[PDB]
Amino acid sequence: STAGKVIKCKAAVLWEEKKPFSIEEVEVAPPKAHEVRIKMVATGICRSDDHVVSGTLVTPLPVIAGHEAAGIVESIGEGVTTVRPGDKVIPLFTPQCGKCRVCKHPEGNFCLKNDLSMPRGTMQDGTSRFTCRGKPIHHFLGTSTFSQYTVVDEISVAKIDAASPLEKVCLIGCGFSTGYGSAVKVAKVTQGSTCAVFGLGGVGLSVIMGCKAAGAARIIGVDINKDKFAKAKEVGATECVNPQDYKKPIQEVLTEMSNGGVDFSFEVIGRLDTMVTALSCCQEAYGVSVIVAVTPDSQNLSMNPMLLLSGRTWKGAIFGGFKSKDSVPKLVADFMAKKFALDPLITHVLPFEKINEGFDLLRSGESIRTILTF
Amino acid sequence: STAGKVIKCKAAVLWEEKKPFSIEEVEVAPPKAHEVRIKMVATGICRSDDHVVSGTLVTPLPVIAGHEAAGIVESIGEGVTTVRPGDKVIPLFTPQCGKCRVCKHPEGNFCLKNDLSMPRGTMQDGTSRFTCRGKPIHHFLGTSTFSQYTVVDEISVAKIDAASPLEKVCLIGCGFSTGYGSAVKVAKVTQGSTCAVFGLGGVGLSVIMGCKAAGAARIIGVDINKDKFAKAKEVGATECVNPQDYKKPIQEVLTEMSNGGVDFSFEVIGRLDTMVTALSCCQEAYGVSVIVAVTPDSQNLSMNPMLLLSGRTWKGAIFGGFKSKDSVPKLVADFMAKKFALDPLITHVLPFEKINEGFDLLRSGESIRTILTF
Ligand SMILES: [Zn+2]
Ligand SMILES: [Zn+2]
Ligand SMILES: [Zn+2]
Ligand SMILES: [Zn+2]
């Protein structure tokens, strides 16, 4: 009744930069070969989506943003073997084609088929499945979750547990996995270790959860906003420090606190100065610092290579270093097995149509995570 | 006949900055508890020693420099158990006390007992064993190899094969191990991988040897001086590239050559701009770049954290990441077992008294490595 034909539905369309999202009636074309049309159930509002709005993250416009979500497959194109109609799925903004050098590399996850490096805003075949009043609308990171229905390439979708709560597990689409993975996959936090987390937002909390799951003895939360501390401690933080409370530089305070420097530090703010501070606070001989965020309007940080010569390791990653398709299902399984809680991260839930309001909450910073429901 | 009493000998003393080395008659006091007096046999002239001269590497003056050497133990102080009189040894500028957090850490080697971070220019007990005309002379990195005899703390000396050629294995004291280790221990080069080595001096060649021993399929030597290419190829380089031959930036050339970016890159020059270039040329998703050198007159490099967010790893190390005392003996064993050749690195051999001449060769750059013999 719906398969093989165009679907008329609503979607949040961004027509121009620095403009509010426009709830428009759009036409979502049927999935071609190796494609998957998905009926959205829930989608999170991530800072990256906002970067598209402010023109910070350059991608073709008009566009249907959104990359953190979960839904139900309504139909599949010819050749699709990984998912079936009715399956609960999560779109992967970072694809896993499984064929490129990166997918075949044991340490890589940034699939060369990504639309992040040089954004085209289309399906893998160079075209779009979206039209508004006969006018073509671009895709976003092969996901475009700000729509009641979306069409994604098979390499950009993962089948998850059929009994999982999509209003919660949608965070696995970006926020949670990014933070959690930075701790568990990128840094590879060891038991009894001391960790320092800069920035206690949603991703920051997820990093803490990862350090906790990894068995870190100490997890020091760092944030200039004291209101973020309670949640941080609730999710795993042993201590919380505010740089504004001190007269001496924060890396100095952290070095003293950890008697020589922390084992693992994470920068989850995307600020040039704290990235350097995060690196500097980890132990000089074996300290590991992970870059979990950087603003799209790329500016250069200033740093002394001496910090690295002593023995430190500096590394970053997208999607917490997780090979998307392989990891997402297992992360949902862990959530289903009660291995971790996602509720502490959800601070607001609004119906999809109030998308602009959800962004006001994001921009104001009073929201850890707003989830849009369909 | 010599043990327990002061030894009168010659040493190259640096009285002031930017001054030539002064061959002076000095008094080397007998080794106290857990100390070792060594009769020097050979010592290399490393750029770091020159940094002491130009005041770049700040350490107390007057001083007896030199940290890359090999010799014979003439006597030991009470409590010494690792070496005995007559033993062939190599002083360790990077100590291995085996007790501090770093020594006990599986990834650390920069022993907290080092005199590099905050130079005191003395023995571990805060005093000196050197006097020239009744005037106290400082030590250097717990080694001071520019003397016919030196006294070092037990944690700063390693016993090596009694049949090894000290005129050659002395390179294990710094140069060779630093380069070799950066490839074999820090970067952990894998078989069939593609490597890029910036700077083809002694340490640069040693990195190549490490990549070769690690089974790298491609080892691209990079240097603006073509005269360094032959030796590079001789030791393992598959290709040699000169940045002055090209119109486009070098990281671009290297990215194209390696079809997407190299697996491992090493900066062995100590230049802020090439460090960034070296990082940028390794693959974005799983590339590893190693900082093998940085000038003591620390200046900040400028870099975009985006290079790291994609998945790259940036790391540096001292003494090639080798836990000094444990590694040195095994490296000599490997040399003795013919696992690698040290001769290609030795370009000049001069008697100890012509030390200043050896530095002229170093400063002019016409020398890969000058070895001083006693
Ligand atoms: Zn996101
Ligand atoms: Zn791929
Ligand atoms: Zn040296
Ligand atoms: Zn130690």
Curated annotation (Swiss-Prot), chains A, B:
Its EC number is 1.1.1.1. NAD(+) binds at S48, G199, L200, G201, G202, V203, G204, D223, K228, V292, A293, V294, F319, R369. The modification N-acetylserine is found at S1. The keyword Glycosyltransferase does not apply. The lineage of its organism: Eukaryota, Metazoa, Chordata, Craniata, Vertebrata. An alcohol binds at S48, H67. Binds 2 Zn(2+) ions per subunit. It catalyses: a primary alcohol + NAD(+) = an aldehyde + NADH + H(+); a secondary alcohol + NAD(+) = a ketone + NADH + H(+). Its main location: cytoplasm. It is found in: Cytoplasm. Dimer of identical or non-identical chains of two types (E and S) coded by 2 separate genes at different loci. Pfam families: ADH_N (PF08240), ADH_zinc_N (PF00107). Zn(2+) 2 binds at C97, C100, C103, C111. InterPro entries: ADH-like_C, ADH-like_N, ADH_Zn_CS, GroES-like_sf, NAD(P)-bd_dom_sf, PKS_ER. It is an enzyme of class 1 (oxidoreductase). Coiled coil: none annotated. This is Alcohol dehydrogenase E chain. GO terms for cellular component: cytosol.
